[PDB]
């Protein structure tokens, strides 16, 4: 039985409850910089494509 | 001829192992499920509208393993309809395996199991952050282009029930009317700027007003109060997004309008985040199954 087609939406109390500090305050700056870091895939979006381009070129 | 049936068993054979153990499929068989699944994608519609109850994964990035443990958890199909928000590859060890295992899954329930595009699902991301090099390690460049081809007519978002707003990064400035994401045409590439753009690549930001700029480089940031007004237009409950790993594998911003999931723990050995998955059921209730981190 498919759930492709073509009620209000609540939330488990019970299950937000199952799963700040200035201590606590640095953890998250520190981790908020390392995603920063880790997300560059801007940097080389022209490289990529030059890649594509003379890969093309090879033929 | 394709055996889905083999293709599956073969892949769920590691299912004990420990982490990256390898799969080795025949090269025709990956193209088999890159085509038979591209065909799939492009007979659905590029905006999903899909019922409750389903489960719905943010990023996994090649890792195998954790998408086994989702599957063990939530339940392997049909157990349970699931939906996926993007980002099976490039960064992880076997991006190769994920989609594969995902790709088959579509093919075996085409009506109870969907894969919406990433921002990874891309060439220009796609060259450089690991999945070329995999392709070109295990198997060739060919088989690169292949996928390349197949991800071009991955669907975009997916309305749940009239009430949940799911895309892989989140809105764009462009969004005025769910009709635009319709006329989007297929196969294509994303483009540098634009809605199909913004909708794989913009962030939610507590602290900006309107739209601002992304850190990314590419694409935008957005407030709560876009958010907010979003919902209120659209006559929607919730956003659902990924493309952020989170502490918790899960986290709310606007008053719990939008979550963002994140379904890989300990991400890429550089993160030690939990990672998680959402359980809808059939009253829209939404609940949070996490994959802790490595202990
Ligand atoms: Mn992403």
């Known amino acids: ?59 | 001829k394709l055996n889905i049936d083999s293709i599956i068993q073969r892949l769920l054979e590691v299912r004990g192992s420990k982490p990256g153990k390898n799969v080795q499929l025949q090269e025709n068989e990956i193209r088999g499920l890159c085509l038979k699944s591209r065909e799939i994608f492009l007979s659905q519609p590029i905006l999903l509208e899909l019922e409750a109850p389903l489960k719905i994964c943010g990023d996994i990035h090649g890792q195998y393993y954790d998408l086994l443990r989702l599957f063990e958890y939530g339940g392997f199909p049909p157990e349970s309809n699931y939906l996926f928000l993007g980002d099976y590859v490039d960064r992880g060890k076997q991006s190769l395996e994920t989609i594969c295992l995902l790709l088959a899954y579509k093919i075996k329930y085409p009506e109870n199991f969907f894969l919406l595009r990433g921002n990874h699902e891309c060439a220009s991301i796609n060259r450089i952050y690991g999945f070329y090099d995999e392709c070109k390690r295990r198997y060739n460049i060919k088989l690169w282009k292949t996928f390349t081809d197949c991800f071009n007519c991955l669907p975009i978002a997916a309305i749940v029930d009239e009430k949940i707003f799911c895309c892989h990064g989140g809105l764009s400035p462009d969004l005025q009317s769910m009709e635009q994401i319709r006329r989007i045409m297929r196969p294509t590439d994303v483009p540098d700027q634009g809605l199909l753009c913004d909708l794989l690549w913009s962030d939610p930001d507590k602290d900006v007003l309107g739209w601002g700029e992304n850190d990314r480089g590419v694409s935008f940031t957005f407030g709560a109060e876009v958010v907010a007004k979003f919902l209120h237009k659209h006559d929607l409950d919730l956003i659902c997004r990924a493309h952020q790993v989170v502490e918790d594998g899960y986290e709310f911003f606007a008053k719990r309008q939008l979550v963002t999931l994140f379904s890989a723990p300990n991400y890429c050995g550089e993160f030690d985040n939990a990672g998680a998955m959402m359980s809808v059921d059939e009253t829209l209730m939404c609940s949070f199954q996490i994959l802790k981190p490595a202990e």
């Open chain 1, 1 to 59: 039985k498919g759930i492709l087609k073509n009620k209000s939406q609540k939330w488990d109390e019970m299950n937000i409850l199952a799963t700040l500090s200035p201590e606590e305050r640095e953890k998250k700056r520190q981790f908020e910089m390392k995603r920063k870091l880790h997300y560059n895939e801007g940097l080389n979006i022209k490289l990529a494509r030059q890649l594509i381009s003379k890969d093309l070129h090879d033929d």
